Amino acid sequence: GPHMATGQDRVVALVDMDCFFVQVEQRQNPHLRNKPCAVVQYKSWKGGGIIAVSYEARAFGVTRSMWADDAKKLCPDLLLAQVRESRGKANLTKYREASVEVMEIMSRFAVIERASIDEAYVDLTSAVQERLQKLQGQPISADLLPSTYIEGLPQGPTVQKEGMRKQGLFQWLDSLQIDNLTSPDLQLTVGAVIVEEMRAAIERETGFQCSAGISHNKVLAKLACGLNKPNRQTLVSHGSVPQLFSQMPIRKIRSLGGKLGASVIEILGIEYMGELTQFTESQLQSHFGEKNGSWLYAMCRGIEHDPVKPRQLPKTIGCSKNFPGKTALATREQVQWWLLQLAQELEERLTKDRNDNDRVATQLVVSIRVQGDKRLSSLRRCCALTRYDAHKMSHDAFTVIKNCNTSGIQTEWSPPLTMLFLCATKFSAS
DNA sequence: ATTATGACGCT
DNA sequence: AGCGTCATG
Ligand SMILES: [Mn+2]
Ligand SMILES: [Mn+2]
Ligand SMILES: [Mn+2]
């Protein structure tokens, strides 16, 4: 009762750019705006592999991981933009630079955690307390929440999307106790006001639209963000969790979409997040380990404590290329040439990073995949990264992997390599 | 022949 | 340190 911690001590938002790489390309080329369009890597094999899809194209069933030729079967008028190719490989610099644009705007409102190229968590707890003290106890107008959905509302005793959104928002605001600076629902509402402002700033200053979730923790904020896309934000209150989770497939919660979530389903004989509440913490720890078990016990009640880490920059800077089927690397000259291509891209990105961010990487990780291996990485080896020089990094990577060539001939490489990966890690301030 | 990233947990 | 999992623009 009075000592049951309810995990309502923070306001956390997740901001995620809508179909991000597509928006980057649509900003650059107005002919692609408000069209079914997708972003592809490469072109020769099956028209290229789609990695981002505008919402107009999604309506035709176009998805990521689809070959462009197949997408064109679903959507003959689909427009395509191709990722830049540099040194023989896809180069994602344009999207990384656009990401920095957005992250720098978000950082004006609060410290952020970069979770991906297109998304960041925000801890708004302090900004909410400030805005509440500024509000002097006056209530929150629906006009301050023009794109906000309140999950679970309207309910109880209009057939248009926007009409329903406004009905739910009015029910929410009507029930608010705007005199209590410690009410979690009020705190979330003010958080949503701030996120409206943040999203407006992003769109005004970049042209990019985003969606967002506002809740008491990272998992609920991410889940909330997905509920009303594109270009909308969703507030998931603590009180909304029992109904929300009662029909929520376990795989929808971040970290449960793979083998662990499948094992929760199979071992416990359940389907939905809410069904987890019927197990004790010890039962869940017995099946899934002490850490997972405690996390599941709290998560299915809407409670999670993972902090928004103060980190706007990536921890690693890496370069990767697959060599599938008949293009696998089977000679030493080939392996060396591609290691050099990767290392040259890595050098360029590292040198820019050192100038921008006042840090230097100190470890080089070299990863390969060998033909016949079912795993995505067949071997990982680290060595020292003491100089931002591509020829040195590629020679070092070759040295750490050369013992993998099972061939007796040193000119040939067997079995051929289907993946090279160079990653710079362990940054230090400089 | 999804491909190219990047974070994090385990031992 | 090296491996596996989870994520999916
Ligand atoms: Mn996105
Ligand atoms: Mn995202
Ligand atoms: Mn996505």
The domain spans of chain A are 1-18+89-249, 19-88, 250-307, 308-430
Of A367, A366, A353, A368, whose CA–CA distance to A427 is shortest? A353
Q: Taking a C-beta distance cutoff of 8 angstroms, is the pair A407, A337 a contact? A: no
Interhelix angle A125-135/A184-206, rounded to 10 degrees, is: 100
Which nucleotide has the shortest C1'-to-CA distance from A365? C2
Contacts (Cβ under 8 Å, ≥6 apart) of A32: A22, A25, A26, A79, A81
Question: Residue-wise over A326-360: b if at least 16 C-beta within 10 A, else e?
Answer: eebbbebebbbebbbbbbbbbbbbbeebeeeeeeb
A85: β partners = A90
Spatial distance between the Cα atoms of A171 and A125, rounded to a whole number of angstroms: 24
Q: Taking a C-beta distance cutoff of 8 angstroms, is the pair A151, A240 a contact? A: yes
Listed by range, residues with Cβ under 7 angstroms from strand C are: A 16-17, 19-22, 39, 41, 51-52, 64, 90, 92, 116-119, 251, 254-261, 375-377, 379-382
* C2: residue with closest CA to C1': A380
Question: What is the distance in angstroms measured between the alpha-carbon CA of A410 and the sugar C1' of B1?
Answer: 28
Q: Is A248 helix (H, G, I), strand (E, B) or coil?
A: coil
Token readout for A62 is 């176009």
Token readout for A79 is 């427009």
Spatial distance between the Cα atoms of A337 and A379, rounded to a whole number of angstroms: 19
Q: Residues within 5 Å of ion ligand 2 by Cβ?
A: A 16, 116, 118-119
Q: Classify the phi-psi angles of A197: left when phi > 0, otherwise alpha if psi is within -120 to 50, otherwise beta.
A: alpha
Q: Is A380 helix (H, G, I), strand (E, B) or coil?
A: strand
Torsion of CA A111, A117, A118, A119, to 10 degrees: -40
Residues 112-141 of A with CB under 7 A from strand B: 117
Ligand nearest to the CA of A19: 1
Of A201, A213, A233, whose CA–CA distance to A101 is shortest? A201
Q: Which sign does the torsion angle of CA A102, A104, A107, A111 carry?
A: positive
Q: Is A106 helix (H, G, I), strand (E, B) or coil?
A: helix
Chain C: nucleotides under 7 Å from a protein CB? Answer: 1-9
Q: Taking a C-beta distance cutoff of 8 angstroms, is the pair A302, A410 a contact? A: no
- Give A118-163 as a DSSP string: TEEEEE-HHHHHHHHHHHTTPPPPGGG-TTEEETT-S-----SHHH
The amino acid that residue A259 corresponds to is: K
A132 Cα to the center of ligand 1, angstroms: 30
* A249 prior amide bond cis, ω within 30: no
For A83, which DSSP code? P
Residues after which chain A is broken (C–N above 2.5 A) are: 157
Chain B: nucleotides under 7 Å from a protein CB? Answer: 1-10
Spatial distance between the Cα atoms of A210 and A229, rounded to a whole number of angstroms: 8
Spatial distance between the Cα atoms of A105 and A206, rounded to a whole number of angstroms: 9
Of A212, A197, A204, whose CA–CA distance to A15 is shortest? A212
